[PDB]
Amino acid sequence: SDKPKRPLSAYMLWLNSARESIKRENPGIKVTEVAKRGGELWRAMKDKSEWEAKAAKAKDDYDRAVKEFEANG
């Protein structure tokens, strides 16, 4: 397999689910101003338990899969 979905922060998972809808509604906003606004929708949407818990899942499928990813010496 290739590089597995590395584990990250919850606010990040949502950042990926809104990265496309973020640059669209935004004027090609810079990556530095993309996080300042991404923090408003993140806490203005529903909650974090969605992504946060989701990160754990990648964790299990990440420690076990990375091995396969690292077994390509």
UniProtKB/Swiss-Prot annotation:
Please verify whether the record's keywords include Transcription: no
Coiled-coil intervals: none
One record GO biological process: chromatin organization
Localisation per UniProt entry? Nucleus; Chromosome
Keyword list (alphabetical) reads: Chromosome, DNA-binding, Nucleus, Phosphoprotein
Q: Which domain of life is it from?
A: Eukaryota
List every position bearing Phosphotyrosine: Y11
Give the sites modified to Phosphoserine: S9
Q: Which GO MF terms are attached to this record?
A: DNA binding; DNA binding, bending; minor groove of adenine-thymine-rich DNA binding
Query: What S-S linkages are listed for this chain?
Result: none
Q: Provide the residue ranges listed under DNA-binding region in this record.
A: 4-70
Q: What is one GO cellular-component annotation here?
A: nucleus
Q: What does it do?
A: Binds preferentially single-stranded DNA and unwinds double-stranded DNA. Prefers sites containing the sequence 5'-ttg-3'. Facilitates DNA bending. Associated with early embryonic chromatin in the absence of histone H1.
Question: Which protein family is it in?
Answer: Belongs to the HMGB family.
This chain belongs to the protein called High mobility group protein D
Q: Which organism is it from?
A: Drosophila melanogaster (Fruit fly)
